[PDB]
Write a protein that binds this ligand. Structure first.
Ligand SMILES: CC(=O)N[C@H]1[C@H]([C@H](O)[C@H](O)CO)O[C@@](O)(C(=O)O)C[C@@H]1O
Ligand SMILES: CC(=O)N[C@H]1[C@H]([C@H](O)[C@H](O)CO)O[C@@](O)(C(=O)O)C[C@@H]1O
Ligand SMILES: CC(=O)N[C@H]1[C@H]([C@H](O)[C@H](O)CO)O[C@@](O)(C(=O)O)C[C@@H]1O
Ligand SMILES: [Mg+2]
Ligand SMILES: [Mg+2]
Ligand SMILES: [Mg+2]
Lengths: 520, 520, 520
C-alpha cells in the first residue's frame, strides 16, 4: 500500500466474533524492532564454555527478527477460551490473515548523557514470509517473543537464529548457511503496509473433552460373557495343592479378567517426584534418573514425551519428572526458581485411555513355566505401538503452543507435536522482519572495506492476525451436568487474568480444554 | 406400520441366497422381553463385596434391553460357513436390514399358586436405535444375549447396562448418567412393526486364508544373493583361535543369515501352559504369571492380546494362558469347569507371519563387544511396531464376534478388534427395546409420590436381520488340492451341529476361516 | 385421531434440540388418572375444624384432574439447564405443543383379598383445554402434580379444585360454581388421541445474568463531579463548634455523597433469621414476627414478596423469614422437617440493584432542624415505587415455576409473578381430563334417583409437551472469565441429579440462572 507519511496504513482490528460452527478471532499488537547483531550475521558456536557434549551446538544469528503468534492467548482471550472449553467438543485452525501496518522507523543519536530519538521518514523495514519453507523453521519450539496475552502490552520482536549439523563445537560439510538477503522481501517506509493470508491443511479436531468411560469399563455389568478364560491352575476344594485346569466365563464380579478388545496407549515411564520435597530422594536426579533419548552420541531429555496420565486416582501430589508442561508465573526467575513461581499442568483426565506416566505399562511372561520352573513375569517400562491401542493426545493450554511443523522425514508415527497442538506438513510460514541498514557518512576517499558505521535506528509498528477456527459442537446425551471451568464466585483481592495495581497482567493458572465429556 | 390386532405385521424371513460375489443372509428369531429393574434405573457399584481394586466399577442398570446379532452363527448356518471358508479368500459386511414385528404384550397375574397370562391389547413396546452413538456402546464386548445359532431356539433379550468413570466404588464429576427415556423412541401395540437399515463403512476383507509361505522362506533356493554378511570373527583353518573378519554371500545352505526385507509381527509374550495338567507348575499362576496391562493403578489381563501363533510346529499340546479365544460347550458351568467342557481355538496357521505367543520375539545386542568385554544378547518379550513388519490379524470363528466399535480416540494403531473381526468408526447401532410401564389402579386421593404399582407384564415378538456380505473370490494357481473343512465321513452317534434327543443344539468345535492358501 | 385398539396413537417424543437463537425441548411422560370424588363434585369448606379466620375457605372439588407442566425440570434436563444458564443472557417461552395419546382405560374388580385389573376397550377419557379462561385458573400457585423431572418416572394426575368468595365457612351471593361437564370436551377410546398448540404473548427475556456493577458504583473513580453538595454544617478549623455552611464537590474519596441518577428497588423488610439455631430468639415468631398482608380482615403471609437480596456481603448465614423460595429434598416430610431436608435459595446476586430484604431501605428526615430542635431521621421498612428506581426481578430455578396468569384487574404494577417467571395476560390454558363414568347394572325397575353404582376404573396414557424457547445471546466484552455453574470435579459416592441404588432420582441443590454478567 501507498500512503503519505501522515496517513494511517491500518486500523486496530482486534475482536472476537462467533457465528454458528466457527469462531473468528482477530488480535492486533504493537511491536518494537531493534537493529540486531549490527546488521551482521555471526557464526555462533558452543566453542569455549566447555558445555557437555549434550549441549554442543553450531549455527547462526541473523540480523532479522521474526513474528510468532503460536500461542493461544495470542488470539483467545480467557473468556473466549472459556466459551471454547465449556461448550465445544473440538476445534482446529482453518485460515489465517496477517497484516503489518503503521510502521515508524526512528533514528537514535547519543551525545554525552542525553539521548535523542527522532523520526527517519525515508527508512525502510523489510518483511518477507518463508512460504516455501526454505529457511530452518524455528517456530514450534516453545520460544518466547510471541504476541502478548494482554492486547495493551507492547512487545519486542525476537531475533531470528537457526542451527545446522554439529560435531562438538565444529561443523560438518553438510551444515547449511542461510542469508535472508537472498530472498525477495517487501520494503516499507512509514507509508507502506504488508499483508498475506494462509490456509491450514485439513487436520483433526483437538479433543476438548474427557472420556466419561475407561478402557477396562466398556462392557455391560449385568451380562456374563460367552467367552471363557483359564481361571485356576490349582484345584479348588482339594485337600492338598493338586494341579488342575479350571475355566470360568466372563462375569461382572471380575471385570479384570474378561477378554477385551483394546489396549491402553503406548507408555515410556518417567520418574515420579512429589510436590512435597520431604518424600523425595536426597539426591539431584533430574539428569541421572532422567528418561532421555540418545541421538548421535548425545543425550537429550524427553519432555514432555509420550502422552501419559500425570497421577492415578487420589495421588494428586505426584508428577512425572519431565512428562508434564510447566508454565512459569510472571515473577519466576530464569533458572532454579521455587515451586510456587511456576504452574504445573495435570493431564490426569486421560488416565481413562492412557498409561500413568510414572507407572509400568504391564506385566509380561519371561520364561516357560513347568512343574519344575516357576512362572515369571517382568514389568514393561517402554511399550511401543501395538495393534489394538487407543490413546488421547496431550491436551492444549491457553498459554501453550498451537501448532508445529511436522519434520520432513521419510517416516513419522502419529505426528501430533509432543507439546500439544496440530502437526502440520505446511504450517503457517515464518515472517522475517529486518530494519534496512542506513549507512552514516562514508569517507571522502574510496574504501572497498566493509561498511561498519551506521545510524543507530529502531522501528515500531502494529501487527494484525485474524484466524478463523472451526468448532465441533457437543451433542452429548448426558443427563447430569458436566464439569465446567469457572472463576471462583467467592471474594479475593484480585480478579483472575487481570492487571494488578502496578499494571501487570498475570495468568494465574494453566487452562486446558478437556471439560465436556463423551463416551469412549 | 398400522394393522389390526388380528393381522401379522411381518413374515418369517430366514434364508441363505448366494449370487456372484455376494452372499445375502437373513435370519429371523423370536424374542421374549421382560420388565427389567421394575421400570427403574438403579445405580450399580462395587460397593461392599470388597472386590479387588482391579474389579472396582461404577455404573447403571437400565429398564431397557437391547438386540445383539454380533456373532456369525446369528446369520451363517454351519453349512453356509463352510461355503464361505472353503471357497473364498475374504469377505466383509456391507449392508444390514432389521425389522421388529408381531409384537405381543401379555399381562401376568399371580393368585395363590396359580398364575394366569393374558393378552394386553393396548400395551406398547418401545424401540429406538442409537444412530448417533450417543449411548455407551455395550455391544462388542463378547456378551451373551445374542441371536441363537439354531433358528428354532427362542431367546430372552439381554438387559442394557453401561458404566462410566470409577475411583474405587465411588464415582467422579465427569462420570455420565443416561436416561433412555430422553431419546425419541417408536411405540408399538400388537399391530405396529419397526424397521431400519444400515450400511457398513468400507473395511478390508477378512483373511479367510492361510499363507502357503513364511517370512523366512520367500527367497529363491537355487540362487545365491549378491549381498554379503559378516560370517566369522575367528579364523577358520587357524591353528589357534585367531581373530578374523570373514565375509560370505547369501546361499541356500544358509537361509537363516541371508539379508531379508521384512520383520515378523509385533509380539507380547504370554505364559505357555500345557493341556496335560502334569507338565504344568504346581501353583495357581493365572494371575501372578499373567501378562496384564496397567491402567489407572488397575490391572486387567490381556486377552486375547496381540495376534500371535498358538504353538510351534509339533507342539500342539500348548496354548498361551490368555492369548487364545475359548468357547464353552453347552454343558460347561459358569466358573471353574473342566478342560473338556470348553473349546480352545488354535491360531497356529499364522506362525508363518507372526511370532508364537509363548516365545521370545528375538535377540538384541545389549553391550559393546571388545577383546575384553564379551558380547551379550538379551531376549525380547515385548516388541512394538517396527518398520518392515507384516502380520496377520487374529482369525474369526462361526461362534465369535463380527465387529466392534473403534474407541473414539485421538489415536489408534491398526484398530482391528482384538477378539477378531471388523473395527468400525460407526458400527451398526444399538437397538434398545423396553416395555412401556402400565400403572395399576392409583388411589382415589391424589399422591405426588412416585408410582410403584404396575401390572406385571412381558412381551414377545419376532426379529429379522438381513445382511449382505461381499466375497473375495479365490484365484489360486496352486496345483495340489488345498485343505478344506469337512464333517467326518465315518460313523458316529451324533451328526455335527444338530439337536440331540432332548432337543438341544450343540456346536461341537470352533470353526475359523483360514483354509484356502495364497502366497505371502 | 382414529385407530384400532392395537395401534399406537403417538410416539415417545422426548428430546433437546438447539438451533441458533432457539432451543426446542420436548418431554413425554406417562400418567395415571383415577376416578376422583366418585364422579361427583363436592362442596368443600373450612366448616368444623375451627381454622383461624386467616385459613377459612369455601369452594369445590371436581371429578376432573388437570395437566401441569409449569416447572422447568418438566422440559429442561439439568445439563440443558446448564447450557442455558452458562451461555445465555436471557430466554423466554414462545410456542407450545401438547398431545395426549396411547390412552388405556382399565376396569378394576375387587373380590375378597384379590384384585383383578382388566382392559375396558369401550371406555372413554375426556380432555378439554380452557382456552377462554372461563374456569378458575389453578395453575401458577406452585402446586404439586406437575410432570416429573425424570422422564422415566410415572406420575399421578392431580385433581382439579377451585375456590370462590368466602366469609368464614359461609359463602356469598357472588361466589361461583363451575361444572366442567358444561364445556365441550373431546372423548377418547384407546384408539383416539388429542392435541393442541399454543403461542405465548410477547414478554421480556428473563435475566439469566448478574450485574458486574452496583447502583452506587456507576461513576468514574478518577474524575471529580461538577456538582456540589452541602458538606459541613459546623466549621472545620474553628476553636469552638461554630455553625457554618461548607460545600464540597463530588470526589472519588467520597462516593457515598456524590449526587446520583437512580434509586435502588422497592423494599418491604422481612425478619432476618440465622441458619444456626443458637443466634435466633427463643420464641416461635414465624407468625407474630411475620411480615404479612391484610385483605378482608384476613392475614396472609407475604412469601416470597418483593424481590430483595437475601443477605449482605459476608453474611451468608442469614435469610428472610418468608422472602426466599425453599425447595424440599425428596426425603423431607410435609410439616416441621429439619433444616437439612430442604434447600433454601440465595438471591444474593441482586444486592447490586435491590435492597437486602432483612434491612432498612434508607433514612428519612422527620422534623425541621433548628438551633433549638435537633435534626431527626427515621428508618424506612416499606418503600413503594419511587421515580428513578431500577430493580432486578426474582430469579427462576430449574425446580421453580415457569409462568403465572396475571390477575384480571383494572390495575397492576410490574406484574412479574412474585415466585419468579413470566406474568401472562393469556397463559397456557388448563387441560382438564376426566374418566367418563361407566354405570354398573341398573335395577330392572325404573328409578329416577341419581345413579351411585359404577365400575371402578382408572386410566393411563402418555402426554407430550414441546416448547420452543428463544435465547438472548451473551455479547459480553469482559476480559476475565465469568462465573459458571459446574458439577464438582472431585470424587463422591453419587453423581449429581441421578437415581440412587433404589432407583430414586434426586435434585441435590436449587439451580438458578444468574451466572453470566453484564454492566448495569
Ligand atoms: C475376579 C478375579 O480377579 N479372579 C481371580 C481369582 C481371585 O483372586 C479369587 O477368586 C479371590 O476370591 O484368583 C485366581 O487366581 C483364581 O482363583 O482363578 C485368578 C482370577 O483372575
Ligand atoms: C548357515 C549358518 O547358520 N551359518 C553360521 C555358521 C554355522 O553354524 C557353521 O558354518 C556350521 O557348519 O556359524 C557361524 O558362526 C560361522 O561359522 O560363520 C555363523 C553363521 O551364521
Ligand atoms: C466522604 C464522606 O463520607 N464524607 C462525610 C464526612 C466524613 O465522615 C469526614 O470527612 C471524615 O473524614 O463527614 C461529614 O459530616 C463532613 O465532615 O462533611 C459528611 C460527609 O458526608
Ligand atoms: Mg462483535
Ligand atoms: Mg433360495
Ligand atoms: Mg438431536
Amino acid at each position: 500500500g501507498a500512503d503519505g507519511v501522515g496517513n494511517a496504513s491500518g486500523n486496530w482490528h482486534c475482536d472476537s466474533t462467533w457465528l454458528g460452527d466457527r469462531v473468528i478471532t482477530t488480535s492486533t499488537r504493537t511491536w518494537a524492532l531493534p537493529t540486531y547483531n549490527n546488521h551482521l550475521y555471526k557464526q555462533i558456536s558452543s566453542a569455549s564454555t566447555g558445555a557437555s557434549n549434550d549441549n554442543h551446538y553450531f549455527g547462526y544469528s541473523t540480523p532479522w527478527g521474526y513474528f510468532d503468534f503460536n500461542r493461544f492467548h495470542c488470539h483467545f482471550s480467557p473468556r473466549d477460551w472459556q466459551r471454547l472449553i465449556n461448550n465445544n467438543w473440538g476445534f482446529r485452525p482453518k485460515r489465517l490473515n496477517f497484516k503489518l501496518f503503521n510502521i515508524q522507523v526512528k533514528e537514535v543519536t547519543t551525545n554525552d548523557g542525553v539521548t535523542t530519538i527522532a523520526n527517519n521518514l525515508t527508512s525502510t523495514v523489510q518483511v518477507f514470509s518463508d512460504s516455501e519453507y526454505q529457511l530452518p523453521y524455528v517456530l514450534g519450539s516453545a520460544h518466547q517473543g510471541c504476541l502478548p496475552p494482554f492486547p495493551a502490552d507492547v512487545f519486542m520482536i525476537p531475533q531470528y537464529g537457526y542451527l545446522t549439523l554439529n560435531n562438538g563445537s565444529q561443523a560438518v560439510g553438510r551444515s547449511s548457511f542461510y542469508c535472508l538477503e537472498y530472498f525477495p522481501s517487501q520494503m516499507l517506509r512509514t507509508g507502506n503496509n504488508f499483508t498475506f493470508s494462509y490456509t491450514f491443511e485439513e487436520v483433526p479436531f483437538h479433543s476438548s473433552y474427557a472420556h466419561s468411560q475407561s478402557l477396562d469399563r466398556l462392557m455391560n455389568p449385568l451380562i456374563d460373557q460367552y467367552l471363557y478364560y483359564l481361571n485356576r491352575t490349582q484345584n479348588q476344594s482339594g485337600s492338598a495343592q493338586n494341579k488342575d485346569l479350571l475355566f470360568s466365563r466372563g462375569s461382572p464380579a471380575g471385570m479384570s479378567v474378561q477378554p477385551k478388545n483394546w489396549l491402553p496407549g503406548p507408555c515410556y515411564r518417567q520418574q515420579r517426584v512429589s510436590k512435597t520435597k520431604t518424600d523425595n530422594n536426597n539426591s539431584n536426579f533430574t539428569w541421572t534418573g532422567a528418561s532421555k533419548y540418545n541421538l548421535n552420541g548425545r543425550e537429550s531429555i524427553i519432555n514432555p514425551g509420550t502422552a501419559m496420565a500425570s497421577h492415578k486416582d487420589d495421588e494428586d501430589k505426584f508428577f512425572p519428572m519431565s512428562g508434564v508442561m510447566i508454565f512459569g508465573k510472571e515473577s519466576a526467575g530464569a533458572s532454579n526458581t521455587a515451586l510456587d513461581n511456576v504452574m504445573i499442568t495435570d493431564e490426569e483426565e486421560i488416565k481413562a485411555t492412557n498409561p500413568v506416566a510414572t507407572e509400568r505399562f504391564g506385566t509380561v511372561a519371561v520364561n516357560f513355566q513347568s512343574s519344575s520352573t516357576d512362572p515369571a513375569t517382568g514389568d514393561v517400562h517402554a511399550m511401543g505401538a501395538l495393534p489394538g491401542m487407543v490413546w488421547q493426545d496431550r491436551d492444549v493450554y491457553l498459554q501453550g503452543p498451537i501448532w508445529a511443523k511436522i519434520p520432513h522425514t521419510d517416516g513419522h508415527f502419529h505426528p501430533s507435536p509432543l507439546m500439544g497442538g496440530f502437526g502440520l506438513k505446511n504450517p503457517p510460514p515464518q515472517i522475517l522482519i529486518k530494519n534496512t541498514p542506513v549507512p552514516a557518512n562514508p569517507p571522502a576517499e574510496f574504501s572497498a572495506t566493509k561498511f561498519a558505521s551506521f545510524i543507530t535506528q529502531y522501528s515500531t509498528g502494529q501487527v494484525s492476525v485474524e484466524i478463523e477456527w472451526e468448532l465441533q459442537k457437543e451433542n452429548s446425551k448426558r443427563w447430569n451436568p458436566e464439569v465446567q471451568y469457572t472463576s471462583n464466585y467467592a471474594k479475593s483481592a484480585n480478579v483472575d487474568f487481570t492487571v494488578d495495581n502496578n499494571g501487570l497482567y498475570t495468568e494465574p493458572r494453566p487452562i486446558g480444554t478437556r471439560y465436556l465429556t463423551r463416551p469412549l
